[model samples]
Target: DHYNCVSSGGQCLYSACPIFTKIAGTCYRGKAKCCK
Candidate 1:
């Protein structure tokens, strides 16, 4: 399945509003980031 993630300040954010389900990690310019 395919889904989208939300984030703020380079951190992962989850919601219970039936729009988000999972969070994933990625690297950007040697920095860690989160995606759902």
Candidate 2:
């Protein structure tokens, strides 16, 4: 499921995201970071 997580920063990743950001929401019903 690849989608731009709106309020979730739209940077939802599986492995990892960028710095200074946090896991805003879930993407694939698993540990995904919707980086803001």
Candidate 3:
């Protein structure tokens, strides 16, 4: 189920989504470093 957002980056609207594996690092200019 795509939450219609990027689960990896800080741009992610959802805290815990079923899209990416995990959330990492800073926002990186409003972009969360996610792992798969």
Candidate 4:
């Protein structure tokens, strides 16, 4: 995947909702960042 997936600031989405399952980072920003 490309870095475009991240925001202009390079910050990834960090959802607080549990329904989101995960927004936390791991490898680059988090495993969630590469979810697809």
Highest lDDT among the candidates is held by which one? 2
At residue 6, candidate 2 shows an lDDT of 59
lDDT measured at residue 12 in model 2 versus the true structure, 0 to 100:
71
**Lowest lDDT block of 10, candidate 3:** 1-10
TM-score of 1: 0.20
Better candidate by TM-score, 3 or 4: 3
Which ranges in model 1 have alpha carbons more than 4 Å from their true place? 1-22
- 14 in model 1: Cα distance from truth in Å? 15
> In candidate 1, how many Å is residue 6 off?
11
Candidate 3, backbone clash total:
2
Rank candidates, lDDT, best first. 2, 3, 4, 1
lDDT of each: 0.36, 0.64, 0.39, 0.38
Candidate 1 displacement at residue 1 in angstroms:
20
lDDT of 4: 0.38
In candidate 3, position 15 carries an lDDT of: 49
Quote each prediction's TM-score.
0.20, 0.47, 0.20, 0.17
Question: Comparing candidate 1 with candidate 2, which one achieves the higher lDDT?
Answer: 2
Models ranked on TM-score: 2, 1, 3, 4
Question: Residue by residue across 1-36, what tens digits does model 3's lDDT show?
Answer: 122224533333234534745554333453543333
Collision pairs in model 4: 25-29, 25-30, 26-30
Query: Per-prediction count of colliding residue pairs?
Result: 2, 0, 2, 3
Q: Give the alpha carbon lDDT tens digit for every residue of 7-27 in model 2.
A: 534677776667776666667
Q: How many Å off is the CA of 27 in candidate 1? A: 2.9
Lowest summed-lDDT stretch of 10 residues in model 2?
Answer: 1-10
Minimal lDDT window, size 10, model 4: 8-17
